[PDB]
Amino acid sequence: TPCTAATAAVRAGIDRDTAYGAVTPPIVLSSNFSFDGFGNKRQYDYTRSGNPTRDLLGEALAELEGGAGGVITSTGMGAINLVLNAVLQPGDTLVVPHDAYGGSWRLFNALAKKGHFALITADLTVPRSLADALAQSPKLVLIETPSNPLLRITDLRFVIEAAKKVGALTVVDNTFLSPALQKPLDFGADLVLHSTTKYINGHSDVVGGAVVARDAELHQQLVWWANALGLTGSPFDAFLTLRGLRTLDARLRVHQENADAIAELLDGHAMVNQVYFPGLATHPGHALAARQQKGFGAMMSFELEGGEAAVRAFVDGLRYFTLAESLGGVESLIAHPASMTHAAMTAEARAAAGISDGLLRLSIGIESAEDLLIDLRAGLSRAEATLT
Amino acid sequence: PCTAATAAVRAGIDRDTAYGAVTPPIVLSSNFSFDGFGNKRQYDYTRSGNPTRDLLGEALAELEGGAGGVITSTGMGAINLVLNAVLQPGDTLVVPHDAYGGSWRLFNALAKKGHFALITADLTVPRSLADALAQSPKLVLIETPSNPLLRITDLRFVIEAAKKVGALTVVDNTFLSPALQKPLDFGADLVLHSTTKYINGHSDVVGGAVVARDAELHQQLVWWANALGLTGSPFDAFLTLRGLRTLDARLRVHQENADAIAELLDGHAMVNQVYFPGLATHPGHALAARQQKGFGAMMSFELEGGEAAVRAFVDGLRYFTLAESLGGVESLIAHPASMTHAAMTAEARAAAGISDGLLRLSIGIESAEDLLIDLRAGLSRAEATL
């Protein structure tokens, strides 16, 4: 045993500065680096290609995920973009979950429409759906678990071992739980990627991505493609994101305490028809989440009884949940998928995906449990006062 | 009304009128336009007032229960600000005998020039207090707990006795932060912090704050901070407010680690004494359980053996950085005889109860088991020099 994940994140680049013995590593904004005399390139030459502040974050995420190295991108979508370009070429097929992130679907549909690769859509929680995708010999399979907004759990070990038997690489989008709560490379995944925008940064003030490869050689291909495509991130953003990472463990202990309390209030409340939260014993994939995850996390959804009118009343005076997109911040957020995250779909597509007009998504922050519960009770009470 | 943790977490949030930004925009601007001829806006010049700095001021004022907050470039600056706003020649200041060494350096320099007269007292000894208060001081400074032996002063007792002779009280609440101690609750006039320590928590800002209970004292601190040029950078205030949002989340881990470490060290064969207010045997325990919401994560202990034992302890620590400061997410160790108190005599240090075997821990938020493994290996290395 090296150290734990909390210790490694908390101590990422403390005692890393050879210049001054600075406890927090200096921010290397510099675009360029001098040669050490004629013909002698130093370790760094140009920030698009390699930068020490960015590489510390890379190395800290590689260490938390258990991989050979990390590449840091300017956005989470850029991390997805990077994998598509390093791994696929025309004639290859990519398998995508039916309920993957809408930005992931938009990018996959736009590039497949040009013939960059072919798409197969699959429900990775249905054995026959997976088996039919894999019988086509795909190059790459994407897993996103838990799914958003219904928190479907995909069985990592099942999917990854079946993919390997037909020679497919697997990439897991581990954004929702972070490396502190789920380690897809422990199950044999080739790649794991994140939007650092979310939990890893935690403070809603950086947009970023990361890809971690299990194998050193795929890592080197990602470095080369990130440099060639211009997808690397800002050193300043890497600085703020490493700062946020240091409290990821301390933040998640409170996030998950709050989510367990909120799930208790919402589950079986008279105004709530269903709760989507892997913590609940009646959630499909509960047992699988209890084994492949180190906690149930702090995202959940619930269907409020009554109309769009009950929703408008619920959301109307919330004091401690901000109506917004994104998630994983220290501040609690609420989103209405039908008018926000899934507004571009038709009504008919939403009913097929199992997204109701009554569905609300919570990103539970680290405010005091007592306040979040008072706020939700007064929201459920405003909603109840519609109803005719 | 919301809890202190909810107020700290939501201090920035959905307060941007330009764009609805969730996180408040950073206002670096030194200057602001007039709204046409003769119409000053709320802000005109960053030295005097700045919205990013005022957000941190307001957050700290809300957490301490005060009427407003002033943000200074350093903690020493915050102490400087109080001395200039409150004292003038002829007035006397009462200071704790074991106050922070930076506070003592400033008090001595300004007293030696006659800005005010100084009385040093042991505020935990009622006779030493009553003798200082009988000299009608204008201002009494309290620093509790003390650094590095964690002496506890009775806030309600000193504040009432100060108030009975017409003195103001100022509490330096750096060590515990507003999340673990609230000196304005007991009637203190002023509370100040080095935000360098727990409030920022990430070892990347040096800063201070002053919160006044009364609106009229707050207005006097704002005028003096502007006139002396003691106000902080808005970037620093942005990073400090960012740190503040996790203060509560961090202190829960810090305190869990500190409880586990105190239990390893207390009565260990290589440890002669642990200074930690959480121990029932520590003088100040009961007072600390009453006036603090937890016992914190600073402690000191006396290692048996030399300086030789201290050198072997420190050589090879993987998870404690040997450095000054405290209150960061990363565990630190310091040796007062060679670091914080090295600028003293052997017998001045012996007079203050500071041995060559004393080590101070600032316990961070790493996993307890890693920190306990690291400390048990330091104690085996020290045993072995014996």
Add this chain to the structure above:
Amino acid sequence: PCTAATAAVRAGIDRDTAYGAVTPPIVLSSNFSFDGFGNKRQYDYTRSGNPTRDLLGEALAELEGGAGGVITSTGMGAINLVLNAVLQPGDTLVVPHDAYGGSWRLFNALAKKGHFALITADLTVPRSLADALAQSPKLVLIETPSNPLLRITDLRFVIEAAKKVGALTVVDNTFLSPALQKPLDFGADLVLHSTTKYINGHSDVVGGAVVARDAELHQQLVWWANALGLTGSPFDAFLTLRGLRTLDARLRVHQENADAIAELLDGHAMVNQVYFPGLATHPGHALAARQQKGFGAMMSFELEGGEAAVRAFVDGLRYFTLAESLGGVESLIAHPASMTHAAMTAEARAAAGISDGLLRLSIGIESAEDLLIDLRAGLSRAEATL
């Protein structure tokens, strides 16, 4: 309107509805609140749109004369964004033979996969252009001046010929900036920059930008940049706009220094050739005097005495840093055979006209007198190696 200097200098000022801040607040926020149920504001998510980023986009669109700008995390991302917005399999792209090596690496990697076909051309040779355009390409890339031999491509010639066959044109305007060359005034569809170079000017941001002449292609670039995740950091936009405000003031000194240095080097017994569009003997001088507002501050020269003369020249330089990149306030030198073009074989370098004697200067804003004393002592060192 107002001039380009005025528009760049004033691109921040009086834009803050919240406080009237003279310099615009840094909007770091990843997200923005809905105004209430069902009411998205102007901004929702920084990957798609951010006000600090859009101010820089708008300032660059205004300097280039375009409908709008997109800001990328790097210059290569800007090239990437254009390739994805404009091309698909079956389309062909025309590329200059001497284009930037990062551009060539990206075009070759994506062409090897069938994303599009490549035609290489010498756009200074009418027949090389005519033969590319007779294939009906979808897009023509122009990079003028070229690096490191400062070849000038005739914008009006290339653009009017591309338009007759229905090709779109994109110009990489990195070397001169919008202050010195406006490709959209000649009819180009797109102009792009590495903002890492002159626009930022302080060597502390990597970034790119694309400006479209037409509102409809602008809207396509916005959509692809969002979908591909190529948009830049708000903080980087803030520093880049800060740099832009001095672009005019910087370029006046850059170009005075470069005229002075060109005068020393073109003379000189130790210099076989100077590549600088300001010299009357440089091929394309007259064309550069008409399509550019100045000759700029990049140049190359061939030092007599091959590699040993180069090592002695470069060895004690005090005011030129041996490094890649360009467009900084600080003077840089690079040796293309061992630095920018090291990955080519000796035979490809000889075919591209890149000698072992070739040195490239990125001339800064240091005093002309200092840069000349430094270059004269480099030329003595070199001569002492014969």
Add this chain to the structure above:
Amino acid sequence: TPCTAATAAVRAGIDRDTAYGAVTPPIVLSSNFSFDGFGNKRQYDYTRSGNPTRDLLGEALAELEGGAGGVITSTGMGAINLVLNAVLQPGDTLVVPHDAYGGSWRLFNALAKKGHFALITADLTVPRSLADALAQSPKLVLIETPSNPLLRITDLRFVIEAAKKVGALTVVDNTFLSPALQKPLDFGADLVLHSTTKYINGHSDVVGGAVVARDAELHQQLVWWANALGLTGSPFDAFLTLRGLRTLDARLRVHQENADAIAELLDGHAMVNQVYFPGLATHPGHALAARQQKGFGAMMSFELEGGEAAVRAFVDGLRYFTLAESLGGVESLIAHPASMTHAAMTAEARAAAGISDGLLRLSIGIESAEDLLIDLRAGLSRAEATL
């Protein structure tokens, strides 16, 4: 050879990173630094007391001013504060100019009123007023040249020599011109200080100060006091200030070209009764300014005919001059001292100081001269339509 001042500012901390060879110096935000094993303090231990990013800026300004070192403070007022605490004690007297910066005056009056030192105000341009202050044996003499907003010039060599004859230290507030246009240590001053908020930073996004001492022993006393009073600045601010410093020389060339064009429009214009600008041969101080300054700067004030109604019509449609306090940024600003900088004063106190209701102050930025002249010509027509 040494290099010029422009070359030193441009190349300040270029290729000085020992960790990576970074061209641009890494920003050291760290509050604390590790000991190199038991009992081995590194060069840096605690950012309040010493930080390498702040020390880079210190050293650059010391090199430009020709001094032994620099201290960087959180504000310019802080830099003045630092000098008062390092140099004076009760019983000492301070001589200040009658038209010093209003913040300097507020601080001098507050600390004098408490008895930190005695205080004498003198007109340092009038030899009798100077000789009477110096005969009272002051410890310290403050010079501010040029003055704001009437651009009065004090003879640096003359006041410094006379201060030295009676044993007084001199401190020059060199904010207005910056080290690029005036070097008070060349004439024998002990101290020079700046608000870096103004020209040195140049981009209106940092408030800061600096103090440079000629002698290494006074520099070490300013370092000790700055640490003890907690007056030191943010390393991020120092990074942004050093960034701005790199263009100071390039900016001032444009500022000065614009100021020369604007002075020529305003001087003898039908709507202008007087221009205060040391570049004019008619300005009292012109010859002194040509001798002790490398250029005439880019601050000026002028008296508009027609009082307050003319001023309101003048400022109403200005497109390229922002109505605001501060100065020395890349963007042109205008201020009206009677309603802005001197609004605190009374009408009789402002009349006494020569500040009319018609006085406008320009901070001329680096926009194209022709845009600034068109804007000012249209303000002068709007003022003239008043009347």
